[PDB]
RNA sequence: GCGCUGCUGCAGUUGAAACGCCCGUAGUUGGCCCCCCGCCGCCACGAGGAAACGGGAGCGCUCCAGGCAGGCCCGUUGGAC
């Protein structure tokens, strides 16, 4: 029993969808604190050495942040541990790259490039509303983000465009049936479908059931449903929309790419 | 509600020189002939089947065209239990399907009691209930066994045949 | 005999096929429940009052003619025992039994039927507590079997 | 004239309960203020209770009784949360908690068979309860009320004494 | 005291069919035995069958044809997971090719081919071949 | 190996092994019958939940034990399940 909390990670207990090699070596960096957890979440140095291959080592990486050459939301970050999550923006100004963390049908993170039209916001899924000091209604989002006075149209589960420059709500998107949705956990992560169900179970997990545009129909838990939009997507998808193939055809796309 | 019910309200009027019938069902048969069922309420159905022979000559003899037979009408309950949410209901077992089918048949030929019953199960055709009657009546009853076999197929699928035994 | 013999006699009454009463029959059912009645008032084991039914006024089978059975027609006129017969006569045949032995104490033979009647008596009053046939205080005790027999009967 | 006479006899058991001076406490509800029941009418509310939730229902007995049980789920201050169990009575000797007996099944794989097996839960009976040995109970989750108990009646199925113990998995 | 009455009759059945008889009587029917016996029917097997009701337990009379060479019953109804069936055809069937066995589901009494067309399980009744 | 620990799958007249007999609680096992309601078991599917190991798709570390790679015009190359 520990006398205290945990700073190390070994390189077999990490997540899957890293995609750490076995070999690598016997230690994986350890995220901080921030707006996404461990489990939902990947280390800043990962995307910069081991995806864009723009460092070989932690000190290049290193040395990038500290030159404040890489952008999260319009805030220089410096921490090679950083969180970065779903639905994040991540700008590089000195080679006028722009891309927006989504998850991919095989249920890993990828890097969708975007435009500037629509690289100045991002979406929250609130999770909770609550009383603060003084009676004062607040709401909080899952990457941490906590807003004073919300309008009280507002509810839970509900999504928020918010916008980077300032951090105001502009518009937000109720919960129903019929408004396209996309799977951040689970079996299911990466699929899009829309509501069609929605039954809730007194005492435990509220249940959603969507179907995917060709015709498929999942079922998932409502902690993990996060509404990109109405009818259409609000922002940019990955190439596929959605659609996760069989093994049969995964294997032929491998076959021909081979 | 129909134009036999006049006819035979008029018979039952002439036979006594207190009842009440429900309704009257009229069944096809292979041949020309026709079958007349009337439908007797369960509780006047033994005050029916005193004179049962009799009314049913006297009602043949005035109107031709069709055989006449007298059979009670019971209900049919689809649940052992009823759950009402609360305590518990219970279907007694004279509202069964089983039950009511046996009493059917018992009812059809009321003057005769079944000595026996039967059901064949051959290799490719339908199965069907073959029942055993009194060597006695034999020819008194022969010319009613397809009428019989009609209204029982009617009133219940189950299909049947009659022998002698 | 079976329960506590080793016999495999198959002694038994065979009822006939058809439910019907006899083409003789003359009675109605008010007139043979009126002579159960007499029969009953008389003191009489409903198994004897059927078997006089049956020579006497040749009925062959009750429920063929009333529907209902003897002492389901009993308990219908609030006739019939608290004590169900086939007990009553268990208890009946351990208290002779006990009054024999108590006569003389080197009979071995009856102190072996007598732990058989018992055992008998134990298992169907156990079976009747349940069901709710008779009352949950009911108990059976040996010492006190005669009196009980004599106020139950 | 209905909610006077509940008020009038929810007035005395105050008053007759001062006089049992045996106990060595004056046992209270704490949500209501003592004073109300020097008020004559009949303005303001004498007896506090709650509704626990999950659709059950809260027995007249708790809203029209006159005892004071802090653990009680309906009038006390404890709350129902977690998993709903259901068994049938083994013990009822102690002031006002039980055992409750629980039935289930083992399977073990090399013989291709079951095992019965029982388990012993105890709990809080509320003095709205009337329970025998035998009767069917439903139990829900609380916090630690003692060394043993972490469950609370909430509902009463009578059963009939004299019929036979069974095995009723639940 | 009586309890499998299935086994009962199969028993009678293999017995009447070793020393070539055509005709045979079992006592207690059940719905299960006419399933059975059913199924063996539209197998070829065993021709065809009458019941004889007496309103105690009816009896059943059958016709053979020198076919049937073993039947029998698995007493305590083990499950059978849909995945698992090859294994207990190999026990206890002569040959994969030809042989039936028995199982009960909450789709009805059918064969494991039928079973395993449908890729559920069950429970387990009897075998005949 | 060993069906010489036997659930699948041993033996109990003579080789080792049926209590001298009966009653009897706990325990185990209990004929047939109602087509559709409630509950328990059961079957199927699904959600949720670490990898490594094991299975398994693809890749010529010269082969192999192995590892997650390589050439170019790469599924957004891939590391599926
Ligand atoms: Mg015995
Ligand atoms: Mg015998
Ligand atoms: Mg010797
Ligand atoms: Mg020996």
Request: hydrophobic share 35%; net charge positive.
């Given at each position: 029993?520990?006398?205290?909390?945990?700073?190390?990670?070994?390189?077999?207990?990490?997540?899957?969808?890293?995609?750490?090699?076995?070999?690598?070596?016997?230690?994986?960096?350890?995220?901080?604190?921030?707006?996404?957890?461990?489990?939902?979440?990947?280390?800043?140095?990962?995307?910069?050495?081991?995806?864009?291959?723009?460092?070989?080592?932690?000190?290049?990486?290193?040395?990038?942040?500290?030159?404040?050459?890489?952008?999260?939301?319009?805030?220089?970050?410096?921490?090679?541990?950083?969180?970065?999550?779903?639905?994040?923006?991540?700008?590089?100004?000195?080679?006028?790259?722009?891309?927006?963390?989504?998850?991919?049908?095989?249920?890993?993170?990828?890097?969708?490039?975007?435009?500037?039209?629509?690289?100045?916001?991002?979406?929250?899924?609130?999770?909770?509303?609550?009383?603060?000091?003084?009676?004062?209604?607040?709401?909080?989002?899952?990457?941490?983000?906590?807003?004073?006075?919300?309008?009280?149209?507002?509810?839970?589960?509900?999504?928020?465009?918010?916008?980077?420059?300032?951090?105001?709500?502009?518009?937000?998107?109720?919960?129903?049936?019929?408004?396209?949705?996309?799977?951040?956990?689970?079996?299911?992560?990466?699929?899009?479908?829309?509501?069609?169900?929605?039954?809730?179970?007194?005492?435990?997990?509220?249940?959603?059931?969507?179907?995917?545009?060709?015709?498929?129909?999942?079922?998932?838990?409502?902690?993990?449903?996060?509404?990109?939009?109405?009818?259409?997507?609000?922002?940019?998808?990955?190439?596929?929309?959605?659609?996760?193939?069989?093994?049969?055809?995964?294997?032929?796309?491998?076959?021909?790419?081979? | 509600?129909?134009?036999?019910?006049?006819?035979?309200?008029?018979?039952?009027?002439?036979?006594?020189?207190?009842?009440?019938?429900?309704?009257?069902?009229?069944?096809?048969?292979?041949?020309?002939?026709?079958?007349?069922?009337?439908?007797?309420?369960?509780?006047?159905?033994?005050?029916?089947?005193?004179?049962?022979?009799?009314?049913?000559?006297?009602?043949?003899?005035?109107?031709?065209?069709?055989?006449?037979?007298?059979?009670?009408?019971?209900?049919?309950?689809?649940?052992?239990?009823?759950?009402?949410?609360?305590?518990?209901?219970?279907?007694?077992?004279?509202?069964?399907?089983?039950?009511?089918?046996?009493?059917?048949?018992?009812?059809?030929?009321?003057?005769?009691?079944?000595?026996?019953?039967?059901?064949?199960?051959?290799?490719?055709?339908?199965?069907?209930?073959?029942?055993?009657?009194?060597?006695?009546?034999?020819?008194?009853?022969?010319?009613?066994?397809?009428?019989?076999?009609?209204?029982?197929?009617?009133?219940?699928?189950?299909?049947?045949?009659?022998?002698?035994? | 005999?079976?329960?506590?013999?080793?016999?495999?006699?198959?002694?038994?009454?065979?009822?006939?096929?058809?439910?019907?009463?006899?083409?003789?029959?003359?009675?109605?059912?008010?007139?043979?429940?009126?002579?159960?009645?007499?029969?009953?008032?008389?003191?009489?084991?409903?198994?004897?009052?059927?078997?006089?039914?049956?020579?006497?006024?040749?009925?062959?089978?009750?429920?063929?003619?009333?529907?209902?059975?003897?002492?389901?027609?009993?308990?219908?006129?609030?006739?019939?025992?608290?004590?169900?017969?086939?007990?009553?006569?268990?208890?009946?045949?351990?208290?002779?039994?006990?009054?024999?032995?108590?006569?003389?104490?080197?009979?071995?033979?009856?102190?072996?039927?007598?732990?058989?009647?018992?055992?008998?008596?134990?298992?169907?009053?156990?079976?009747?507590?349940?069901?709710?046939?008779?009352?949950?205080?009911?108990?059976?005790?040996?010492?006190?079997?005669?009196?009980?027999?004599?106020?139950?009967? | 004239?209905?909610?006077?006479?509940?008020?009038?006899?929810?007035?005395?058991?105050?008053?007759?309960?001062?006089?049992?001076?045996?106990?060595?406490?004056?046992?209270?509800?704490?949500?209501?203020?003592?004073?109300?029941?020097?008020?004559?009418?009949?303005?303001?509310?004498?007896?506090?209770?709650?509704?626990?939730?999950?659709?059950?229902?809260?027995?007249?007995?708790?809203?029209?009784?006159?005892?004071?049980?802090?653990?009680?789920?309906?009038?006390?201050?404890?709350?129902?949360?977690?998993?709903?169990?259901?068994?049938?009575?083994?013990?009822?000797?102690?002031?006002?908690?039980?055992?409750?007996?629980?039935?289930?099944?083992?399977?073990?794989?090399?013989?291709?068979?079951?095992?019965?097996?029982?388990?012993?839960?105890?709990?809080?009976?509320?003095?709205?309860?009337?329970?025998?040995?035998?009767?069917?109970?439903?139990?829900?989750?609380?916090?630690?009320?003692?060394?043993?108990?972490?469950?609370?009646?909430?509902?009463?199925?009578?059963?009939?004494?004299?019929?036979?113990?069974?095995?009723?998995?639940? | 005291?009586?309890?499998?009455?299935?086994?009962?009759?199969?028993?009678?059945?293999?017995?009447?069919?070793?020393?070539?008889?055509?005709?045979?009587?079992?006592?207690?029917?059940?719905?299960?035995?006419?399933?059975?016996?059913?199924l063996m029917?539209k197998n070829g097997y065993?021709?065809?069958?009458?019941?004889?009701?007496?309103?105690?337990?009816?009896?059943?009379?059958?016709?053979?044809?020198?076919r049937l060479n073993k039947a029998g019953?698995?007493?305590?109804?083990?499950?059978?997971?849909?995945?698992?069936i090859e294994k207990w055809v190999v026990n206890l069937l002569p040959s994969r090719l030809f042989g039936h066995i028995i199982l009960?589901?909450?789709?009805?009494?059918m064969d494991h081919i039928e079973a395993q067309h449908?890729?559920?399980?069950?429970?387990?009744?009897g075998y005949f071949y």
């Amino acid at each position: 029993m520990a006398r205290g909390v945990r700073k190390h990670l070994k390189r077999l207990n990490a997540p899957k969808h890293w995609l750490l090699d076995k070999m690598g070596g016997i230690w994986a960096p350890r995220p901080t604190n921030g707006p996404h957890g461990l489990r939902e979440c990947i280390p800043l140095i990962l995307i910069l050495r081991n995806r864009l291959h723009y460092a070989n080592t932690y000190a290049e990486t290193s040395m990038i942040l500290q030159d404040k050459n890489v952008l999260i939301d319009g805030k220089p970050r410096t921490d090679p541990t950083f969180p970065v999550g779903f639905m994040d923006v991540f700008e590089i100004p000195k080679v006028h790259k722009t891309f927006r963390v989504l998850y991919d049908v095989k249920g890993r993170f990828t890097l969708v490039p975007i435009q500037s039209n629509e690289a100045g916001f991002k979406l929250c899924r609130v999770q909770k509303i609550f009383l603060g000091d003084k009676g004062m209604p607040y709401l909080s989002t899952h990457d941490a983000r906590t807003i004073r006075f919300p309008h009280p149209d507002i509810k839970t589960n509900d999504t928020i465009k918010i916008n980077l420059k300032t951090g105001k709500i502009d518009e937000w998107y109720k919960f129903d049936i019929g408004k396209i949705v996309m799977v951040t956990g689970g079996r299911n992560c990466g699929r899009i479908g829309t509501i069609q169900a929605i039954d809730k179970h007194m005492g435990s997990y509220t249940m959603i059931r969507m179907k995917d545009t060709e015709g498929t129909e999942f079922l998932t838990r409502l902690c993990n449903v996060f509404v990109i939009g109405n009818d259409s997507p609000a922002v940019a998808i990955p190439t596929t929309k959605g659609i996760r193939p069989d093994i049969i055809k995964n294997r032929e796309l491998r076959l021909r790419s081979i | 509600l129909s134009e036999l019910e006049k006819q035979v309200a008029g018979t039952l009027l002439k036979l006594e020189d207190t009842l009440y019938i429900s309704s009257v069902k009229e069944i096809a048969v292979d041949g020309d002939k026709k079958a007349a069922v009337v439908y007797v309420p369960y509780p006047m159905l033994q005050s029916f089947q005193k004179n049962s022979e009799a009314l049913i000559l006297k009602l043949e003899k005035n109107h031709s065209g069709h055989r006449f037979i007298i059979v009670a009408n019971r209900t049919i309950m689809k649940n052992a239990y009823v759950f009402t949410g609360k305590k518990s209901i219970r279907r007694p077992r004279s509202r069964t399907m089983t039950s009511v089918y046996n009493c059917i048949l018992d009812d059809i030929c009321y003057p005769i009691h079944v000595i026996g019953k039967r059901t064949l199960y051959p290799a490719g055709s339908n199965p069907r209930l073959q029942v055993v009657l009194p060597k006695a009546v034999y020819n008194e009853v022969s010319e009613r066994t397809k009428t019989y076999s009609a209204v029982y197929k009617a009133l219940t699928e189950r299909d049947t045949e009659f022998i002698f035994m | 005999g079976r329960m506590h013999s080793k016999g495999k006699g198959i002694s038994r009454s065979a009822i006939p096929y058809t439910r019907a009463p006899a083409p003789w029959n003359k009675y109605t059912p008010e007139d043979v429940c009126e002579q159960i009645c007499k029969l009953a008032k008389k003191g009489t084991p409903p198994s004897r009052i059927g078997l006089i039914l049956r020579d006497q006024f040749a009925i062959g089978q009750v429920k063929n003619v009333t529907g209902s059975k003897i002492v389901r027609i009993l308990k219908a006129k609030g006739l019939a025992p608290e004590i169900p017969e086939d007990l009553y006569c268990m208890i009946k045949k351990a208290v002779a039994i006990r009054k024999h032995l108590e006569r003389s104490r080197r009979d071995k033979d009856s102190k072996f039927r007598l732990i058989l009647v018992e055992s008998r008596i134990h298992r169907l009053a156990r079976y009747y507590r349940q069901a709710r046939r008779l009352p949950p205080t009911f108990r059976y005790k040996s010492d006190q079997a005669a009196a009980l027999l004599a106020t139950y009967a | 004239r209905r909610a006077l006479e509940r008020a009038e006899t929810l007035r005395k058991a105050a008053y007759e309960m001062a006089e049992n001076q045996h106990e060595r406490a004056y046992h209270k509800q704490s949500q209501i203020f003592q004073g109300r029941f020097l008020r004559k009418d009949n303005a303001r509310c004498l007896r506090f209770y709650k509704s626990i939730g999950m659709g059950y229902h809260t027995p007249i007995t708790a809203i029209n009784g006159t005892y004071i049980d802090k653990k009680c789920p309906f009038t006390g201050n404890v709350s129902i949360r977690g998993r709903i169990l259901r068994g049938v009575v083994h013990s009822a000797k102690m002031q006002r908690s039980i055992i409750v007996r629980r039935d289930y099944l083992h399977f073990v794989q090399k013989y291709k068979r079951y095992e019965r097996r029982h388990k012993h839960v105890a709990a809080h009976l509320s003095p709205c309860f009337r329970v025998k040995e035998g009767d069917i109970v439903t139990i829900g989750e609380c916090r630690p009320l003692s060394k043993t108990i972490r469950f609370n009646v909430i509902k009463v199925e009578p059963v009939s004494e004299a019929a036979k113990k069974r095995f009723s998995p639940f | 005291v009586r309890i499998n009455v299935l086994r009962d009759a199969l028993k009678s059945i293999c017995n009447a069919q070793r020393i070539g008889k055509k005709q045979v009587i079992v006592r207690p029917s059940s719905k299960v035995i006419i399933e059975f016996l059913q199924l063996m029917q539209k197998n070829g097997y065993i021709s065809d069958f009458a019941v004889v009701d007496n309103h105690r337990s009816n009896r059943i009379v059958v016709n053979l044809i020198g076919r049937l060479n073993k039947a029998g019953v698995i007493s305590p109804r083990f499950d059978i997971p849909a995945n698992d069936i090859e294994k207990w055809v190999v026990n206890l069937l002569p040959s994969r090719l030809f042989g039936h066995i028995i199982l009960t589901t909450s789709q009805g009494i059918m064969d494991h081919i039928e079973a395993q067309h449908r890729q559920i399980g069950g429970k387990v009744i009897g075998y005949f071949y």
